[PDB]
């Protein structure tokens, strides 16, 4: 009978826990460290390209930092594949929302959108969750810049800054140490890069080992501008940190 074979994903711990969720979180520990910060003027996105190599092609490669919308891009902690699913969906969802209201989605709506979607696997289906969590970087009309997060459990919060993947507590400490509310993006940039270089598990923090992006309302603007830095640009700003 089929019963033999069910891992019974959604069943509660005797303590009321979901080990898959637990273990998904656990794989996320193994995920490449990814960090994001809501500055006063913008939001910074930097994450470590994990498991890199020489003939690994960096430029086209994005394994972490993906753009759902021009006001919403995200960093990914988890299976690259799984997120891309949710990535695509959210985009549509936003696009739908856009196509619904001709207006961009307030980030949480999209966030909570994916939140319950993860939660979909959580409470039903016998289906494994995604081993993925996210940095949600978004700008809205309402709260302006918004930095959110999610966990495979779908539980999700806002942040002034946040880190995911490995070394989170370390980063969190460094972040919860060094952060201050009024920080400008470029400060947070290096600050992360500082945190990154330090929380870097490898020897050196290098562009080719990183994905980086920013959400910023430019100086000539009224269009809050997302940007992913090119490896060189990353490598360039990598120098600007003095990290060189």
Q: Which is nearer to another protein, 20 or 206 (CB)?
A: 20
- Compute the least distance from the CB of residue 190 to another protein, in Å: 18
Q: Which two tokens stand for residue 218?
A: 């430019």
The single residue among 32, 34, 36, 38 that binds another protein, judged by CB under 8 A, is 38
The DSSP code for 32 is P
CA distances for 37 relative to 33, 98, 179, angstroms: 14, 26, 9
| Angle (nearest 5°) at CA 159 between 142 and 149 | 95
Give residues 78-137 in contact with another protein (rule: CB under 8 A).
79-82, 84-85, 88, 91-92, 95-96, 98-103, 106-109, 112, 115-116, 118-119, 122-129, 131
- Compute the least distance from the CB of residue 201 to another protein, in Å: 17
Distance between CA atoms of residues 130 and 150, nearest Å: 11
- Compute the least distance from the CB of residue 242 to another protein, in Å: 25
- Compute the least distance from the CB of residue 69 to another protein, in Å: 7
**CB atoms < 10 A from the CB of 109, how many?**
13
Give residues 8-27 in contact with another protein (rule: CB under 8 A).
8-17, 19-20, 23-27
Binding residues for another protein, how many (CB under 8 A)?
A: 99
| CA dihedral of residues 174, 34, 40, 175 (deg, nearest 10) | -10
Q: Which is nearer to another protein, 159 or 229 (CB)?
A: 159
Instruction: Say whether residue 233 binds another protein (CB under 8 A).
Output: no
The single residue among 33, 133, 167, 172 that binds another protein, judged by CB under 8 A, is 172
Helix (H, G, I), strand (E, B) or coil at 73: strand
Q: Which is nearer to another protein, 202 or 240 (CB)?
A: 202
Give residues 147-166 in contact with another protein (rule: CB under 8 A).
147-148, 153-162
Q: Which is nearer to another protein, 123 or 202 (CB)?
A: 123
Instruction: Say whether residue 222 binds another protein (CB under 8 A).
Output: no
Helix (H, G, I), strand (E, B) or coil at 58: coil
With tokens 């913008």, the residue in question is: 42
Give residues 187-206 in contact with another protein (rule: CB under 8 A).
none
Instruction: Say whether residue 47 binds another protein (CB under 8 A).
Output: no
SS3 per-residue string spanning 25-44? HHHHHHCCCEEEEECCCEEE
List residues bridging with 148 in a β-sheet.
Answer: 136, 158
What letters, b where the CB count within 10 A reaches 16 and e where it falls short, cover 168-179? Answer: beebbebbeebb
Instruction: Say whether residue 40 binds another protein (CB under 8 A).
Output: no
Instruction: Say whether residue 220 binds another protein (CB under 8 A).
Output: no
Instruction: Say whether residue 53 binds another protein (CB under 8 A).
Output: yes
């Amino acid at each position: 009978g089929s019963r033999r074979y069910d891992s019974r994903t959604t069943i509660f711990s005797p303590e009321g826990r979901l080990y898959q969720v637990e273990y998904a979180l656990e794989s996320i520990s193994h995920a490449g460290t990814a960090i994001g910060i809501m500055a006063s003027d913008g939001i910074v996105l930097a994450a470590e390209r994990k498991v890199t190599s020489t003939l690994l092609e960096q430029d086209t490669s994005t394994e972490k930092l993906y753009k759902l919308n021009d006001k919403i891009a995200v960093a990914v902690a988890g299976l690259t594949a799984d997120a891309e699913i949710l990535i695509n969906t959210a985009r549509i969802h936003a696009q739908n929302y856009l196509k619904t209201y001709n207006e961009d989605i307030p980030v949480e709506i999209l966030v909570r959108r994916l939140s319950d979607i993860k939660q979909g696997y959580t409470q039903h289906g016998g289906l494994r969750p995604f081993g993925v969590s996210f940095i949600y970087a978004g700008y809205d009309d309402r709260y302006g810049y918004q930095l959110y997060t999610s966990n495979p459990s779908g539980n999700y919060t806002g942040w002034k800054a946040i880190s995911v993947g490995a070394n989170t507590s370390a980063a969190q400490t460094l972040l919860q140490m060094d952060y201050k509310d009024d920080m400008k993006v470029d400060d947070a940039i290096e600050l992360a890069l500082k945190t990154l270089s330090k929380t870097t598990d490898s020897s050196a923090l290098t562009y080719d080992r990183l994905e980086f992006a920013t959400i910023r309302k430019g100086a000539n603007d009224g269009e809050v501008y997302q940007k992913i830095f090119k490896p060189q640009e990353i490598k360039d700003i990598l120098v600007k940190t003095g990290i060189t």
